[PDB]
Design a protein around this ligand. Sequence first.
Ligand SMILES: [Zn+2]
Ligand SMILES: [Zn+2]
Lengths: 21, 16, 154, 181
Amino acid sequence: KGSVVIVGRIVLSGKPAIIPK
Amino acid sequence: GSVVIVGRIVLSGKPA
Amino acid sequence: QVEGEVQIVSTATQTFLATCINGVCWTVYHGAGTRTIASPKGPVIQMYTNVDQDLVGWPAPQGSRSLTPCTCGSSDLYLVTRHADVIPVRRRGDSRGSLLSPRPISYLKGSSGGPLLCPAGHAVGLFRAAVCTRGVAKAVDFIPVENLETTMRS
Amino acid sequence: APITAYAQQTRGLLGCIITSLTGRDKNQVEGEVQIVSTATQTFLATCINGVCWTVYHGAGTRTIASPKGPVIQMYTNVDQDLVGWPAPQGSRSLTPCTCGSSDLYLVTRHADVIPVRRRGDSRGSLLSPRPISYLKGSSGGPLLCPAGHAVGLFRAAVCTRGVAKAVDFIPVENLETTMRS
Ligand SMILES: [Zn+2]
Ligand SMILES: [Zn+2]
């Protein structure tokens, strides 16, 4: 059988931020 | 005069 | 392109916040008044105007994302300011909360229209006004999300 | 501070298949929850205390692709429906819940967070029910307490005519028990 593969992520540790222009 | 949008806040802190 | 739920917003005389919930961009009437919102195609008319609740709404702009309303019943809330600071408030009544930790008034200035979040990050209400004692805010007025929900339905 | 989450896709269908066969994955790793895939299915893996945990019904007996080639599981427990690998370099770990809370928050693969009330040590109910399809692919994801610490891992939805009313989870205690044997 093939390996399990990371295809994305979910990040819980980010805080509200002003989106840089 | 209109309200203008000068910036945005992303609550999760998702980067560009 | 990453999207924001909160927009930083301005008129000739002030600057404050708006918050997108259920496809609508919502803010305080005492800031926006009856104004249109800017878009690359020209001014857009308010969808909702409710002077009693101090509430206005426009269609959400490009670059935005809707916040989902709170449906847990929590009374631990988090107020998000225009500098993206987050301040814990405890819910006291349906329009009212106290800061766990009081701040100078200037720390909250320009943040009306911003969201109060439950612990799940869902919208409980919109910050209406600071409740002040000699330059120290120790409480907040807010517009419960139920009013927004009603305003739409009606 | 409240629980908020974002998802990022790091790899497409073709790159995933290739990486699956070679077992060699050069990508940078970030975050507490990994979005994870095999040939047949995609689900979640949660890092807790330096170990990357997910559901057996998803990973079976498989290795995980890593920068050094395939990595073998550290823990395997068919009965609790658990597997674990060493947490990949770059990931960040959650820590177990030590408050006693019964207000939980489930994080889905689209990075939505949904309130659940604990109803027993392996079940909780959705305060506000969703179609089962909103939960697809979320197996192995975290249930969080209000302080953002780990209470358990999503295992299966409990539903009724396609609507999720409740969820079964693997309590974080089952993780320690698996580690001991
Ligand atoms: Zn809530
Ligand atoms: Zn806890």
